[PDB]
């Protein structure tokens, strides 16, 4: 369990809902890349990885196909034991120290996501935001649950309230985590 | 409310002392229950929960399946580590250190740095390491950068200068930021 | 350039 560097080559995910799937590689808790299974392309998270590293997207499509085949057999073996919804933990914090004028990024850490089906959206003064919103894939955890991170590139003003709307089956109402400078 | 059946496969590699110690653990998970796994130290497929025996016994019986998984210590773990040295293990991001007074409390904001290895200390005037500081755990930004906020229970005086000493492997000399 | 290695999952018994 104890090691200098922990890596995952990779995190193979498939679920009955959709049916949707995910394939990504991780190193020391950070995502290297994710394979866009529909577009059949490898999307690297760093500019350094895009220039010096490559991955065959065919490996992901074949692995998810094995996962699709394996899931159906284990459902019958478990006697249709469905996944129980978990209460997620939402935390909102800035990337750099907040200073009016300097460009900053708002991070919305959504921990303990199970099953991996979540809607993370941003709200500024009650209005939905889509501009400058980036989202990472489902990052694996040791307890076999997931965590997703959402970003919001903004400029802190004199009066501008921000909220992170998280929609999950583990919650009856969408959880809102407020943030203000 | 909607019914969902989740399946997970995690092919993990554990590296210690570079290429000296390497361990592979392929985890087969149904929802959140890990039923089957293959440990490189074990050498064979083993059942974790009562949902694992049919899978583990079938994978151990097949000679081609066992030979492939045993060989994965060199074909994927040792192979990708050589590729990791050229990019990820060579990646060094210098942290941004700033002090903000929150006026009987000082916060040392160490922002955007890689790797995780960091040592932050709060000093009172000159060579007096304070023992009354509360540091936040290593915060993961997710975009290959880390941040750590070190708070200090401070009482100011007429001629008091508070310095924050930050050590990171990307720097040849530590970062010292003062506050008057 | 050399491609990244990947773990192949073992197929479950269909019988």
């Amino acid at each position, epitope marked *: 369990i104890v090691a200098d560097h922990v890596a995952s080559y990779g995190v193979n995910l498939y679920q009955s809902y959709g049916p949707s799937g995910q394939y990504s590689h991780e190193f020391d808790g950070d995502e290297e890349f994710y394979v866009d299974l529909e577009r059949k392309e490898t999307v690297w998270q760093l500019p350094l990885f895009r220039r010096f590293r490559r*991955f065959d997207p*065919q490996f992901a*499509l*074949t692995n998810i196909a094995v996962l699709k085949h394996n899931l159906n057999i284990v459902i019958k073996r478990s006697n249709s034991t469905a996944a129980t919804n978990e209460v997620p933990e939402v935390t909102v914090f800035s990337k750099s120290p907040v200073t009016l004028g300097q460009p900053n990024t708002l991070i919305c850490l959504v921990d303990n996501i199970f099953p991996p089906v979540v809607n993370i959206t941003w709200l500024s003064n009650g209005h939905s935001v889509t501009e400058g919103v980036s989202e990472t894939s489902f990052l694996s955890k040791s307890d076999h649950s997931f965590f997703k991170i959402s970003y919001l590139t903004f400029l802190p003003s004199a009066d501008e309230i921000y909220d992170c709307k998280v929609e999950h089956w583990g919650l009856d109402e969408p959880l809102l985590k407020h943030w203000e400078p | 409310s909607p019914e969902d059946f989740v399946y997970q496969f995690k092919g993990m590699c554990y590296f210690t002392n570079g290429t000296e110690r390497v361990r592979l653990v392929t985890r087969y998970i149904y929802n959140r229950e890990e039923y089957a796994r293959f440990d490189s130290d074990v050498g064979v497929y083993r059942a974790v929960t009562p949902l694992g025996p049919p899978a583990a016994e079938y994978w151990n019986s097949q000679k081609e399946v066992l030979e492939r998984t045993r060989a994965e*210590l060199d*074909t994927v773990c040792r192979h990708n580590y*050589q590729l990791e040295l050229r990019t990820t293990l060579q990646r060094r991001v210098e942290p941004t250190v700033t002090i903000s007074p929150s006026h009987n409390l000082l916060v040392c904001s160490v922002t955007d740095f890689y790797p995780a290895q960091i040592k932050v200390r709060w000093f009172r005037n000159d060579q007096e390491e304070t023992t009354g500081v509360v540091s936040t755990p290593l915060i993961r930004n997710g975009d290959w950068t880390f941040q750590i906020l070190v708070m200090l229970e401070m009482t100011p005086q007429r001629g008091d200068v508070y310095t924050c000493h930050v050590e990171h492997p990307s720097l040849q000399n530590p970062i010292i930021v003062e506050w008057r | 350039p050399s491609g990244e290695g990947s773990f192949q999952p073992s197929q479950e018994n269909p019988q």
Partner: T-cell receptor, first 112, second 112 residues
Framework: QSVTQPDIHITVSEGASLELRCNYS??????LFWYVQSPGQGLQLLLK??????LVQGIKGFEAEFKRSQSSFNLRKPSVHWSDAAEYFC???????????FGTGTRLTVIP | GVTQTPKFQVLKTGQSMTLQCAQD?????MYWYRQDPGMGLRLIYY???????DKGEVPNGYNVSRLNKREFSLRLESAAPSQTSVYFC????????????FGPGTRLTVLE
């Protein structure tokens, strides 16, 4: 990535030692294979290598040693049989590439 | 095992013929090759998984359709004398560098 076979046709007597030359282009972690193709039949894998011991033992009493410095994977047999009279192909692969490059093929005739 | 229908076929320049291939090994990847003397094996089309099709090195004058996990067919719209070759159908568990299991083969001769 490519594979080369210098021999096109080898004629040998039954019981005599065999050596089928095969050398590969490049590979960080190569996947080297050996296939046998009998007349009127398909290709059947004899032996394979990707990791472990350099000397690999395969089916039909065949063996091969992986030379990384010489970049070759020559197939050898101490005593050849009349049933071994078939076309031999050696394939190459890589860990991070879902592709397989087959050789031109070497014809083998064993006189009983 | 891999089953290929038919075994032999004689066609005229312009005729249409479909090569049916089936495997009972629960393999995801299925392949369609053509064996020619001196050239070796040249991949036409390959299906990595069900509902997925990709071009090989010689896909001109051919079209494929993956019906299910066990069946994969090779369709010829217009026959050409350059397509006169023995066709082999292969299958592997998931990747191209896995043990490939070949069928008996289908000899094809196109005449004007």
């Amino acid at each position: 990535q490519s594979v080369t076979q210098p021999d096109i046709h080898i004629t040998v007597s039954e019981g005599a030692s065999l050596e089928l030359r095969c050398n590969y282009s490049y590979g960080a972690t190569p996947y080297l294979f050996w296939y046998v193709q009998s007349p009127g039949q398909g290709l059947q894998l004899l032996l394979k290598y990707f990791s472990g011991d350099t000397l690999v033992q395969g089916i039909k009493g065949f063996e091969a040693e992986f030379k990384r410095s010489q970049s070759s994977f020559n197939l050898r047999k101490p005593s050849v049989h009349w049933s071994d009279a078939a076309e031999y192909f050696c394939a190459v692969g890589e860990t991070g590439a879902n592709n397989l490059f087959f050789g031109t093929g070497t014809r083998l005739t064993v006189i009983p | 095992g891999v089953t290929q229908t038919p075994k032999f076929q004689v066609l005229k320049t312009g005729q249409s013929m479909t090569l049916q291939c089936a495997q009972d090994m629960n393999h995801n990847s299925m392949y369609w090759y053509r064996q020619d003397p001196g050239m070796g094996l040249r991949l036409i089309y390959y299906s990595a998984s069900e509902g997925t099709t990709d071009k090989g090195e010689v896909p001109n004058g051919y079209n494929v359709s993956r019906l299910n996990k066990r069946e994969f067919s090779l369709r010829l719209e217009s026959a050409a004398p350059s397509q006169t070759s023995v066709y082999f159908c292969a299958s592997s568990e998931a990747r191209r560098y896995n043990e490939q299991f070949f069928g008996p083969g289908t000899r094809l001769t196109v005449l004007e």
